[PDB]
């Protein structure tokens, strides 16, 4: 990996509100699309925050 792919990869490995299909999808995207690693990371962060928000909704009911 280049530096961008490697930093996006490490963060994406750790995200607790991704499932393994999503995580593996973002990691394949980093491999396929190295010049957009920061974009891939942004998409993964948004999804992680949305699925974390869905947990707050479950807690609320």
């Amino acid at each position: 990996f280049n530096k961008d792919q490697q930093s996006a990869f490490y963060e994406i490995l750790n995200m607790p509100n991704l499932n393994e299909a999503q995580r593996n999808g973002f990691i394949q995207s980093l491999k396929d699309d190295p010049s957009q690693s920061t974009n891939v990371l942004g998409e993964a962060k948004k999804l992680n925050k949305l699925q974390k928000a869905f947990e707050s909704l479950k807690s609320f009911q």
Partner: peptide, 26 residues
């Protein structure tokens, strides 16, 4: 911590409206 907004329409289950302070739920 970032804020989420939940909308409950009269007589409906609650739904996510907004997350991460300023992002729209799908």
């Amino acid at each position: 911590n970032t804020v989420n907004w939940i909308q409950q329409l009269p007589g409906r289950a609650p739904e996510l409206l907004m997350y991460d302070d300023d992002l729209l739920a799908p």
